[PDB]
Amino acid sequence: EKVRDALKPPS
Amino acid sequence: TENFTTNLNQLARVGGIDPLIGREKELERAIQVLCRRRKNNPLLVGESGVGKTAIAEGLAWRIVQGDVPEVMADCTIYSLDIGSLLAGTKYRGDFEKRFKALLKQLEQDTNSILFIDEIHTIIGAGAASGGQVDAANLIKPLLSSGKIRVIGSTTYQEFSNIFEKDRALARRFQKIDITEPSIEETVQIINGLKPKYEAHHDVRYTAKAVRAAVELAVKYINDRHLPDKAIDVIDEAGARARLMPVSKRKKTVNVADIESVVARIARIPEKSVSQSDRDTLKNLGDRLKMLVFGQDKAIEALTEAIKMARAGLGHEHKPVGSFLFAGPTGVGKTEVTVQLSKALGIELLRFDMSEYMERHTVSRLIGAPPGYVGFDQGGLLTDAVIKHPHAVLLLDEIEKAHPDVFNILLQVMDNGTLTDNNGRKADFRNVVLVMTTNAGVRETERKSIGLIHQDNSTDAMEEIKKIFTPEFRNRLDNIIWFDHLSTDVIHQVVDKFIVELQVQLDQKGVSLEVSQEARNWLAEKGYDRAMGARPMARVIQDNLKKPLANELLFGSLVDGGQVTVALDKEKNELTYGFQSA
Ligand SMILES: Nc1ncnc2c1ncn2[C@@H]1O[C@H](COP(=O)(O)OP(=O)(O)OP(O)(O)=S)[C@@H](O)[C@H]1O
Ligand SMILES: Nc1ncnc2c1ncn2[C@@H]1O[C@H](COP(=O)(O)OP(=O)(O)OP(O)(O)=S)[C@@H](O)[C@H]1O
Ligand SMILES: [Mg+2]
């Protein structure tokens, strides 16, 4: 259930 | 990438890394793998505490010292902290860029080795948000090429459950098994590390103290492995000196202090019994004889067995004592065991075996019910002894229990160790095992059809043979046959119940006085050889407790007052004087 998340900035 | 990695060579040159004594065979094999054209990645797999990380880190200590082949000289070993690689890799590609940067440094120099402790953690570390691009995938191609050398360290459990699942990664790594050292080579390890522990605690260790710490730990500490199992004592022994006054043996630690530490770690009685214990031990027979009468043979067996164990003549791997108490009703089979725990001030582990008649209930002693998904996968008997290694184990009415229980105790009495389904082993070397059985009670109660009455004590023994298997009975120390209570000891038994009554009465504030003639009258009315001592309690309850109860509640004893009991010879009935206040 616990999953890591990778984000990305717009620019 | 200096933050993520640490140079063992630099760390070893200044502070030290607890040098690696021996282990020449393992290091030679590791260096052989590191000199391979391809797949030159050794993996140090072993149990915990077997020096897996001392070999990899020790290799750096040897390099600076120069005790390595010329091919290994000038090599730098770097230890990877995966926690720092994944420190701030929130944005996509931070981990891959960060991790790949580290590999380029290793490939560029080509004379650097990477040490990854707990290597099983790179199988799912920061791969992606539901992605399969993990660190193991990023290192895999480089490992096969042979451009970089990586030393791994992982336990057997982790290597099989996790590392072995990735067959591709396991292929690259050459498993180098590490084995627990022997007693002789182990003392050499402590001698080499001793200078580091002596300086830290400002103490000195004797030649015999080290030999004893190793041998004693192996004997008693069974949940650890030898290289570290023997350093916990050494390390803890020196700490004791610091806590003690500066003038109190701070300079050196002797063999006596070492055995003290082991006793605390294993929660077992220490050797060199104090004079306090001796007084209690010598008086153990007399104290028990004041609460249980007519069973001196049983008390002698229990006390003597305990004395042999403390003296150092006990069984090597068997328990302190395994006994089977068979006898008529109310003869003190369970009372002597219950009072033994109070005399020794140790926990009583009383298991009623009438609740284990079913076969499925025997799995609870060494495990959990079939198909239990929770966490409590432990056994009542195994966990009890683990919590209380020094205790009295009482299996009441064991004959009622399923025959499987007997098979469970064969290793308890022959080897001293019972293992749970999980695989952990319990120690029964200090737990006094006492069993009680009422086998052949009907044979004794009934009377033989003949002119001459027959003693059916032997019939019970034959029944014992039928119920218990020969293997189970051979392991037992001795089968004590309790005997019927004679008229002489019954007088002592009545005195015991009377004092118990007085203790209950003291709280109410009333003092009871019973004449000697009255006490004898109680014995004659309630004496029953077949029924033992329990009828004596009932006659006292019906005669003494009943009148007192009504008076205490309904009048003349609400407020504490003295009581006196006397016997009327003419009437052959007891008398009482309430005498309130
Ligand atoms: N020469 C030596 N041989 C064996 N053990 C040593 C030696 N010198 C020190 N030790 C001890 O052994 C420990 C290392 O035990 P290892 O079996 O390598 O396990 P580890 O690196 O702690 O990893 P785990 O706990 O097994 S996953 C050190 O932390 C010391 O307590
Ligand atoms: N030898 C004895 N000396 C003093 N009290 C005794 C003696 N035997 C029995 N009693 C008392 O009698 C009661 C029962 O004693 P137990 O030891 O449970 O008897 P037992 O014969 O082992 O019982 P079972 O039911 O036959 S296993 C308690 O109140 C004991 O204190
Ligand atoms: Mg009993």
Q: Return d(Cα B337, Cα B325) in angstroms, integer.
A: 10
For residue B430, the 8-state DSSP code is: S
Rg of chain B taking only CA atoms, in angstroms: 34
| Beta strands B478-481 and B322-326, pairing class | parallel
- CA neighbor of B68 nearest in space, from B114, B20, B107: B20
Residue with the nearest Cα to atom 17 of ligand 2? B332
Residues B217 and B262 sit within 8 Å (Cβ to Cβ) = yes
Dihedral, CA of residue B12, residue B14, residue B16 and residue B17, to nearest 10? -30
Residue nearest to atom 30 of ligand 1 (CA): B228
Residues forming a β-bridge with B574: B567
For B88, nearest residue in chain A (alpha carbons): A6
CB B186 within 8 A of CB B21: no
DSSP 8-state code for residue B319: -
Strand partners, B565: B514, B576
Q: Which ligand is nearest to the CA of B179?
A: 1
Q: Could you please report the per-residue DSSP string of B481-536?
A: E--PPPHHHHHHHHHHHHHHHHHHHHHHT-EEEE-HHHHHHHHHHH--TTTTTHHH
- Looking at residue B284, its amino acid is L
Distance B335 CA to ligand 2 centre (A): 6
Q: Nearest-CA distance from A9 to chain B in Å?
A: 8
CB B34 within 8 A of CB B149: yes
3-state SS string for B76-106: EEEEECHHHHCCCCCECCHHHHHHHHHHHHH
Find where tokens 């005399």 sit.
B343
B86 neighbourhood in chain A, CB within 8 Å: none
What experimental approach yielded this model? Answer: cryo-EM
d(CA B84, CA B3): 7
How would you class B372 by CB atoms within 10 Å of its CB: exposed for 0-12, middle for 13-18, buried for 19 or more? exposed
Q: Which two three-digit tokens encode residue B405?
A: 């229980």
The Cα–Cα gap between B170 and B172 comes to 5
Contact B92 A9 (CB under 8 A): no
State how far the Cα of B148 lies from the Cα of B125, in Å rounded to an integer: 20
Residue B505 sits at the vertex; the CA angle it makes with B504 and B510, to the nearest 5 degrees, is 165
Question: Considering Cα of B295, then B298, then B304, then B309, what sign does the dihedral take?
Answer: negative
B80 Cα to the center of ligand 1, angstroms:
17
Distance (Å, whole) CA B195 – CA B16: 12
Sign of the CA dihedral running B506, B511, B515, B519: negative
Largest CA distance in chain A: 30
Give ∠ CA B447-B448-B449 in degrees, rounded to 5. 120
State the helix-helix crossing angle for B94-109 and B135-145, rounded to 10 degrees: 20
Burial class (CB in 10 A: 0-12, 13-18, 19+), B139: buried
The helix-helix angle for B255-266 and B226-243 (nearest 10°) equals: 110
Place of tokens 């019910």: B369
Q: What is the 3-state secondary structure (H, E, C) of B158-193?
A: HHHHCHHHCHHHHHHEEEEECCCCCHHHHHHHHHHH
DSSP symbol at B399: G
- List C-alpha distances in Å: B165 to B28, B124, B161, B162: 28, 12, 7, 5
Going from the Cα of B357 to the center of ligand 2, the distance in angstroms, rounded, reads 23
Query: Alpha-carbon distance B534 to B527, whole Å?
Result: 10
CA gap B195, B203 in Å, rounded: 10
Ligand 3 ion: Cβ-proximal residues, 5 Å cutoff: B 334
Write phi, then psi, for B86 (nearest 5 degrees): -95, 20
Residue A10 token pair? 């717009």
Q: Cα B62–B64–B66 angle (5° rounding)?
A: 65
Task: For CA atoms B497, B501, B506, B509, give the dihedral sign.
Answer: negative
- In sequence order, the 6+-apart residues with CB closer than 8 A to the CB of B296 are B285, B289
Residues 6+ apart with CB under 8 A from B25: none
8-state DSSP, B251: S
Q: B91–A3: do the CB atoms touch at under 8 Å?
A: no
Structural tokens at position B295: 């069973």
Q: What does the alpha-carbon distance between residue B525 and residue B539 come to, in Å, rounded to a whole number? A: 7
- Residues whose CB falls within 8 Å of the CB of residue B184, separated by 6 or more in sequence, listed in order: none
Selection from B470, B490, B574, B483 nearest residue B534 by Cα: B490
Of B468, B438, B430, B265, the C-alpha closest to B349 is B430
Q: Which residues, listed in sequence order, are joined to residue B116 by a DSSP beta bridge?
A: B152
Specified resolution (Å)? 3.2
How far is C-alpha B190 from the chain's CA centre? Answer: 26
DSSP letters spanning A1-11: ------B----
Q: Within 13 A of B29's CA, how many CA atoms are on the CB side?
A: 12
List the one residue out of B220, B213, B255, B207 whose CA is nearest residue B234. Answer: B213
Q: Is A3 part of the contact surface with chain B (CB cutoff 8 Å)?
A: yes
* Largest distance between two CA atoms of chain B: 116
Query: How far, in whole angstroms, is CA B275 from its chain's centroid?
Result: 26
Which residues in A lie closer than 8 A to residue B92 (C-beta atoms)? 6-8
Looking at residue B76, its amino acid is T
- Alpha-carbon gap, residue B195 to B190, rounded angstroms: 9
Among B85, B89, B92, most A C-beta atoms within 10 A, so best to mutate, is B92
Give the orientation angle of helix B296-311 with respect to helix B333-344, to 10 degrees. 40
Asked whether B217 and B229 are in contact (CB, 8 A), the reply is yes
B402 Cα–ligand 1 center, Å: 45
How many other β-carbons are positioned within 10 Å of the β-carbon of residue B569?
Answer: 9
In sequence order, the 6+-apart residues with CB closer than 8 A to the CB of B137 are B127
Query: What values do phi and psi take at B333, rounded to 5?
Result: -65, -45
Sheet containing B391-396: which strands, arranged edge to edge? B347-352, B391-396, B432-437, B322-326, B478-481
Subunit contact A9:B130, Cβ cutoff 8 A: no
Dist. CA B102–CA B84, nearest whole Å: 12
- Residue B509: how many other CB atoms lie within 10 Å: 13
C-alpha distances in Å from residue B59, one per residue of B66, B337, B501, B547: 10, 57, 74, 86
Q: Regarding beta strands B322-326 and B149-154, do their DSSP bridges make them parallel or antiparallel, or are they unpaired?
A: unpaired
Q: Flag if B91 and A4 touch (Cβ within 8 Å).
A: no
CA B219 to chain centre: 12
* Tokens linked to B286: 């007399």
* B112: amino acid identity, one letter: S
Helix (H) or strand (E) run with residue B384 in it:
helix B380-387
DSSP B437: E
Closest CA to B269 of B113, B417, B429: B429
The ligand whose atoms approach the alpha carbon of B329 most closely is 2
In DSSP terms, which residues pair with B352 in a beta bridge? Answer: B396
Coil, helix or strand at residue B128? coil
For residues B190 and B230, the answer to whether their CB atoms sit within 8 Å is yes
